[PDB]
Amino acid sequence: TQQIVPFIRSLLMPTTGPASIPDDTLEKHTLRSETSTYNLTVGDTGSGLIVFFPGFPGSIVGAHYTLQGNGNYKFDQMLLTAQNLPASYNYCRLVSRSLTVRSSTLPLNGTINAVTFQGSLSELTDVSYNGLMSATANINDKIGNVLVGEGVTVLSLPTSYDLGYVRLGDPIPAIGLDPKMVATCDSSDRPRVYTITAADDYQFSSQYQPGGVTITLFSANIDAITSLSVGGELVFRTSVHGLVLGATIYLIGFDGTTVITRAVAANNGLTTGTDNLMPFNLVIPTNEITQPITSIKLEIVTSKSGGQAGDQMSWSARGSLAVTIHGGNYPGALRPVTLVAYERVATGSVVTVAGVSNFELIPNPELAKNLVTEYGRFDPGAMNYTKLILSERDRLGIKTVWPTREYTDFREYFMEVADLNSPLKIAG
Amino acid sequence: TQQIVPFIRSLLMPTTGPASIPDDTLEKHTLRSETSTYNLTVGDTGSGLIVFFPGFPGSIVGAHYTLQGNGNYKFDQMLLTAQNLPASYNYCRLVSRSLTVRSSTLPGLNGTINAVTFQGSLSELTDVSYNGLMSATANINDKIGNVLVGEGVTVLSLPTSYDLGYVRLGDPIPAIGLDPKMVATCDSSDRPRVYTITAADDYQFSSQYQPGGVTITLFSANIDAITSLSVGGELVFRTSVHGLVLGATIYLIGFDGTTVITRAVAANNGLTTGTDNLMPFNLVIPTNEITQPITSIKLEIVTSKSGGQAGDQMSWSARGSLAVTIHGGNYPGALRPVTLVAYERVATGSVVTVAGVSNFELIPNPELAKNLVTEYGRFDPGAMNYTKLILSERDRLGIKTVWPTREYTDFREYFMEVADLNSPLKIAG
Amino acid sequence: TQQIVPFIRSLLMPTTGPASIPDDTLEKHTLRSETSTYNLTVGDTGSGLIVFFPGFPGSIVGAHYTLQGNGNYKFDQMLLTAQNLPASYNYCRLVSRSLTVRSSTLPGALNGTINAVTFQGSLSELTDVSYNGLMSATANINDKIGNVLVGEGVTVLSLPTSYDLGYVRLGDPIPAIGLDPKMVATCDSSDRPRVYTITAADDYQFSSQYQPGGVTITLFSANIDAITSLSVGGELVFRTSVHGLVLGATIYLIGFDGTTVITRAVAANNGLTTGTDNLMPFNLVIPTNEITQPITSIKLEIVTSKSGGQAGDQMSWSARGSLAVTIHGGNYPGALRPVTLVAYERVATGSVVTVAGVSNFELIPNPELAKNLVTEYGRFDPGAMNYTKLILSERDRLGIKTVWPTREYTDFREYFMEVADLNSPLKIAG
Amino acid sequence: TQQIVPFIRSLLMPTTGPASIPDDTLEKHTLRSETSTYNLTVGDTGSGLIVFFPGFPGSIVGAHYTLQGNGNYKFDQMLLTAQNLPASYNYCRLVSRSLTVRSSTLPLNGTINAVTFQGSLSELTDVSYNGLMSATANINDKIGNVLVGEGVTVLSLPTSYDLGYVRLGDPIPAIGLDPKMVATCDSSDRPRVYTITAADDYQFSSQYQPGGVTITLFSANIDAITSLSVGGELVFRTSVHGLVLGATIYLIGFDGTTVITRAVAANNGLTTGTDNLMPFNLVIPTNEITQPITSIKLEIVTSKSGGQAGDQMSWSARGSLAVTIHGGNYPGALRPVTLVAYERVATGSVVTVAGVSNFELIPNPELAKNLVTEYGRFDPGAMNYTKLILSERDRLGIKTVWPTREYTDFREYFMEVADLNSPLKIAG
Numbered sequence A, D: 001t002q003q004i005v006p007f008i009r010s011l012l013m014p015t016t017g018p019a020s021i022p023d024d025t026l027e028k029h030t031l032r033s034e035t036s037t038y039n040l041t042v043g044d045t046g047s048g049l050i051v052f053f054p055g056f057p058g059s060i061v062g063a064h065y066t067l068q069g070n071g072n073y074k075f076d077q078m079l080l081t082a083q084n085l086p087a088s089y090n091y092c093r094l095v096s097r098s099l100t101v102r103s104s105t106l107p108l109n110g111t112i113n114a115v116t117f118q119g120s121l122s123e124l125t126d127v128s129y130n131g132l133m134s135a136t137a138n139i140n141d142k143i144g145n146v147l148v149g150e151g152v153t154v155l156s157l158p159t160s161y162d163l164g165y166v167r168l169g170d171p172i173p174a175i176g177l178d179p180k181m182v183a184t185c186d187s188s189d190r191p192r193v194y195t196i197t198a199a200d201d202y203q204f205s206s207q208y209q210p211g212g213v214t215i216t217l218f219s220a221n222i223d224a225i226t227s228l229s230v231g232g233e234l235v236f237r238t239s240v241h242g243l244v245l246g247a248t249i250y251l252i253g254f255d256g257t258t259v260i261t262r263a264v265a266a267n268n269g270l271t272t273g274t275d276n277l278m279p280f281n282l283v284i285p286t287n288e289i290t291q292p293i294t295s296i297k298l299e300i301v302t303s304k305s306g307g308q309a310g311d312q313m314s315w316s317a318r319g320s321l322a323v324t325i326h327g328g329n330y331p332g333a334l335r336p337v338t339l340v341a342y343e344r345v346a347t348g349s350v351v352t353v354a355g356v357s358n359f360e361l362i363p364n365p366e367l368a369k370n371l372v373t374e375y376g377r378f379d380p381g382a383m384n385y386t387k388l389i390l391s392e393r394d395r396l397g398i399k400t401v402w403p404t405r406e407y408t409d410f411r412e413y414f415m416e417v418a419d420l421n422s423p424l425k426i427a428g
Numbered sequence B: 001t002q003q004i005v006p007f008i009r010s011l012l013m014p015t016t017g018p019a020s021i022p023d024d025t026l027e028k029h030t031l032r033s034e035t036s037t038y039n040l041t042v043g044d045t046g047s048g049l050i051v052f053f054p055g056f057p058g059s060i061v062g063a064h065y066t067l068q069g070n071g072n073y074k075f076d077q078m079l080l081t082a083q084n085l086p087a088s089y090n091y092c093r094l095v096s097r098s099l100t101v102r103s104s105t106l107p108g109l110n111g112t113i114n115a116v117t118f119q120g121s122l123s124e125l126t127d128v129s130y131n132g133l134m135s136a137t138a139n140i141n142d143k144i145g146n147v148l149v150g151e152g153v154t155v156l157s158l159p160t161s162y163d164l165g166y167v168r169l170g171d172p173i174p175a176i177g178l179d180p181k182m183v184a185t186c187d188s189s190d191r192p193r194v195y196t197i198t199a200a201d202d203y204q205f206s207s208q209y210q211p212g213g214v215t216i217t218l219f220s221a222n223i224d225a226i227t228s229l230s231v232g233g234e235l236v237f238r239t240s241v242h243g244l245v246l247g248a249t250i251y252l253i254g255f256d257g258t259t260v261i262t263r264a265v266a267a268n269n270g271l272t273t274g275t276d277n278l279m280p281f282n283l284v285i286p287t288n289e290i291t292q293p294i295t296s297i298k299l300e301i302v303t304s305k306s307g308g309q310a311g312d313q314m315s316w317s318a319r320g321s322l323a324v325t326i327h328g329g330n331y332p333g334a335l336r337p338v339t340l341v342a343y344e345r346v347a348t349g350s351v352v353t354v355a356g357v358s359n360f361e362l363i364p365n366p367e368l369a370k371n372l373v374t375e376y377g378r379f380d381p382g383a384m385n386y387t388k389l390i391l392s393e394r395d396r397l398g399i400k401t402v403w404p405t406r407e408y409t410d411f412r413e414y415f416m417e418v419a420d421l422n423s424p425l426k427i428a429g
Numbered sequence C: 001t002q003q004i005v006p007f008i009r010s011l012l013m014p015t016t017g018p019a020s021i022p023d024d025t026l027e028k029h030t031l032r033s034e035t036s037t038y039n040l041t042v043g044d045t046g047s048g049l050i051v052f053f054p055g056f057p058g059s060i061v062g063a064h065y066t067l068q069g070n071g072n073y074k075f076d077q078m079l080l081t082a083q084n085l086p087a088s089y090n091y092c093r094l095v096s097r098s099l100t101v102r103s104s105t106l107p108g109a110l111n112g113t114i115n116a117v118t119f120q121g122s123l124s125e126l127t128d129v130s131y132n133g134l135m136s137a138t139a140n141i142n143d144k145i146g147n148v149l150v151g152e153g154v155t156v157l158s159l160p161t162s163y164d165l166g167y168v169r170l171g172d173p174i175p176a177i178g179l180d181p182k183m184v185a186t187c188d189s190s191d192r193p194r195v196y197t198i199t200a201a202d203d204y205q206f207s208s209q210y211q212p213g214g215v216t217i218t219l220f221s222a223n224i225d226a227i228t229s230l231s232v233g234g235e236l237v238f239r240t241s242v243h244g245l246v247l248g249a250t251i252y253l254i255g256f257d258g259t260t261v262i263t264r265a266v267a268a269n270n271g272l273t274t275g276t277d278n279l280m281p282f283n284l285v286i287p288t289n290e291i292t293q294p295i296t297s298i299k300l301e302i303v304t305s306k307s308g309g310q311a312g313d314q315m316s317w318s319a320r321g322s323l324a325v326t327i328h329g330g331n332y333p334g335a336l337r338p339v340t341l342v343a344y345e346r347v348a349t350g351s352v353v354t355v356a357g358v359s360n361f362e363l364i365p366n367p368e369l370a371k372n373l374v375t376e377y378g379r380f381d382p383g384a385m386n387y388t389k390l391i392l393s394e395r396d397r398l399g400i401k402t403v404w405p406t407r408e409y410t411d412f413r414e415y416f417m418e419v420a421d422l423n424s425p426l427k428i429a430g
């Protein structure tokens, strides 16, 4: 520390403002802060979960779920940046981010457990208040039973530097006959791909039914916050004449709710002694994803034209599908997740979220006319200092989740120099 | 500056030759320069536009458009590297590049130049007129106005990110096939760009019967492509009317409004009542089909009926989104920064001369690799820090992406004041 | 060199253990070593080829092929890491790797030599893979070694092809339930895909007389590379003047040994209508587990038959379209790219060619292991990367090879690594 | 640089005058400069090509070709030294050379592309204005789209030192009955040899023709500016009686034009069941070569004494030829070539060439009576300095082809000491 190092200051105290990442990604950019402010209402059980995406390169900060009588979560709302970055910028990179979670009202209130998990949302094996505590072995990535009144601070720590600029989901110039037409340029670099072999000569056998017989061929945990696509093909064989197949893909939210439902093939006759192809050509736009996607499943309906008492409908199925979630493997886009769980909070009280997110940004064409961009400030040793700090993360006690009181202490313990500027004022 | 720093020299004075980028991308490579030389002819209006892709990792340097009586641009030709890199190399990275635009011959001084570097791809520019260019950036060192054509302009490529991966060039891959016109390449793929177009969300179509059908343009959207791309996704059609037949075509439109590529996506396609009718998109567009930069995509649909009469009212509902993936499209330099050089008031028939040097890190193809030694880059510490410092002070140093050539020449000699032979190595021991 | 530099030590002497790569990719990770041990049996010809993927970010180390009487190679087995990384970890980055190849046992035989090269391309890109032909795959003298005695053996050392690489997703199983026992769901290496584009036809005219059973053609064949999952997309469009033509089409993915690895019917029994486009879409996804050996080429066959049929019937169609073969994470440096070939010949039939290696990784544990596996940011030492850059910059004058006569590598180890100095007065400090 | 180094000065600024090459070739010699001055006229297409032989040890500097409507070149003239060195000197060595090409009149004018190619003229795969640019990979051996008004400077850079003295094509004392008798002593050291196996049991078969049937047995690219010879033998076998063979060798110029035509065997009966020899004993003197030779071809005429409708004439041929071009492999004699191409220059305008060539020379016997010769000035470190400079050629930007403006700048940037001579004038 001398004066200090703008980047370290920004990284460890994001509410302080942005600084350019001192890596090798030399783009002309501009630096911005976006606040997040939410007043969430506590449900009947007095318990709930905030899912944060600490590294998300853009306006999505997290999602809030209330816990219900029956032990299920129920989606409340997305937690966003104050304004929608893709409306003004085309490219983006996360510099630093911190969020504060505490109670503000009562109609004192319970406790908080928090973890930073090194995987995407659907990968967590246990998301209960208590179960959170073992999502990492890292002591500085979990905090237990912090009083809600005092609150918790979530600090975003890096998962890789020299990251590319991410395209935001920015609207692209387009005209179309449909009012509800939407055209964007999506986060794409570093896609995540899931491959699901749904069937390898899977035999299906069942008696006839008016209305048909529905099965769930598979269900698989995947993650998506933004646009994705499904490709691939199932091949069906049969000895039985006049079978008609229906198939639907469901994308399921964290709360078990159907987020998206897409008929992949409806009313589709099967021919005897031939391959019957069922292609998958799904594109799911960002705006359709009303809450984080947590799993994908495929249902198949089998029915017969004629039909009787005992008819026995049978088919064989083979094939694999590929689920590409665009930009999904970009560190921060899905990957690190910070869960903040609260319980025993009085029903009707307010859980207050306040955060600052800092970005390197490239303006969209209209803003670029009035927004000057520059290469980052050069200070050598900024990156080495960051590397040193992170290297000593555990001995320094630099947490991703803090009791706010402890984070406040840390701020003043660190940051003991901010020294005006000695004789520039008297120099010459 | 001590002696100097090969990379800085190469970056600021590309005509000087190549140097390895001093980042962390440690590959065994070889360093090469490729010249670009063009003598472009000025059209009737005395006005035109050169689109440069200053950061393009490969042989595509830009494109020339003439401006026409009716105010439209008309494509002239691609501006390329002297030789086709993908014929000899498989992987590539741009080190540095500069280009010069000026007039040489006058027919039996000519006008002015405006230039900008725009931080987006070609189709993203809101205004591409000679005058309108000047506001594409707010950055004073990324625009230059009313430079005399005789003196000319210098385009200097400034970085948009280091630690970039090697890009696969569009290199031919060994292949045999029954078709003479068969082409197999391995394309720039890393860092794709993806556009998502929701063309319809229960869009109702309604119209009276027509012999030959009724054609509509469902959507049109600005996209960018110079190299291979693909279109995926699906539209779903519903209808109450029997015997409707659908035709659908995708058009990829050039900067000059011209159709570059036209692909029937579904021709003659009967719609069944009370069911989803699927129209999949499985398009792959190879690089060699893209004769000029793609600027927009549109989809037309033809609706016709088997029978047909006077008043028949054909109706359908449509739902679905498409995804346009342009391979390696988000790789910084591949589409992103664009430098426009516009000229006007140049006498018709005069020559606008382009001369450039492009510098590359390259990996040879298998046949060349047998005779082309590759190495890790020369190590000099502080090269990257010095680059970072220079760029950090870009504006106070006045390091432009577009220069009046005279000012760039001055800068060269102002900078580069040491190139000092090599003092007593010659007398050492 | 002072003490030394853990990373350089790991890079140049991988059997020594792992160290964090001193680049800018700051992830909380853990460091691990995985051994590779194989005892390969020499075939009838006394000759064979080991294909190594020195930079592979994961458990695939290489593949062994024996050479046969007829001059063809025949796949033996994949060479892997001791345990399957994707079963325990989700993300991975290669730190360093070295492998040893030597004779250990013989029947009865005093012959046997190794030629080896590191080729800066993927397997299918090599123009000549014969024992002798290897020697010209690079011009780099420190990337080839010739006629090393098999008894002494060869050392393959993995040298970097780029730092600041992203973590690669391993082919890790993803939680899934399904009606099929043989159901498999993974999250694959995807970042940095490789894409091949094949224009299979541009108004290609087909013409042939009728045949019971049909007339099969190979429309195209193209060299591609795949070790892990890939997909095929695109479309062919067929036109015809002849009524009642039925088309069959199959894609074959062919192994290095000319053997069919994967065969997928793309369209079987498919009637063509007169005066219209007839679409043949490609919607293929090939999962990793189906790829039993490295894929070296792709070909498409088309069968043309007619419902009726007679003596002279002349079946004709026109075809247009291109396909795209995406191999997931294929362009990630190391995934396909550098290949080291170790060829042996004149080894006595029935003798053992022994492979021993160590691979070092930066790893992120899967959710179950993450509960008990502490992860950290890498040890900071400044000048580690500069020192690496210096070393590599002077690679040729230092004689740092990717393929060594083992005896020469051993000498190099002791020539380098002349300081490992205990730790002077910490023991007496205060 | 101290004062400077005469040789480096001469090498980098040839217009400055000659200096002795500081190698080990210690001959008593004399130093001379010869200018080259040409005013070339631009043809109909406004386009043309100047071929320079930058290293030529003697009076041949280059050749000018105009480009024609049909895309062919047409030879204009040889570009020579001001006076014919072989008339006055017997031996010679090139020290340094520079030439300038620019427009001097109009009847504003076009552009120049230039390259130095490390091979002889006929070896260039592409000689078009645009194609030139890829003849080398060396950035300092090519220059693109230089304005003709400003012009280009060609600088000759070494291709080997410790070269022998070359015999010029000097006239030798001789008397003869023929007025047109010419006797010279030619550049011979380091011959270049081409070997052409024209036939290895090549079967010829064709129907009879009054006047015969002519074939071109082979055509091969070779290079010659000065004297050459053709040796070797073809052997013909046949089953057919009364066949008569004619054979002619053509040496073809760069412009596709026949430079030299020599009947090798005219009217030559073939005997059945025997080898029929056709020897090659050609000597081509320098003075017959009116423009650079670019290829050699051999035509054979086959005719029959009798002759009818269908007669079928057949022969088998075997043998190889050797083309020796005297002194051809002497570095500079054929080897490096610098091409200066211009286009878009107005028809009728003058392209002006001005150059200086510097030589080490040994006078002919008559001049030797009045021309003092000496061993070169000794300065140690001259050669090391040259080696250093050339070793750093690319970082110093020492080009073989320059935009003249850039070369002029270089001259004044270099050559910053030429310091009179401080107190010799005041010494003692």
Ligand SMILES: [Ca+2]
Residues within 6 Å of the ligand: A023, A024, A162, B023, B024, B163, C023, C024, C164
């Ligand atoms: Ca870096």
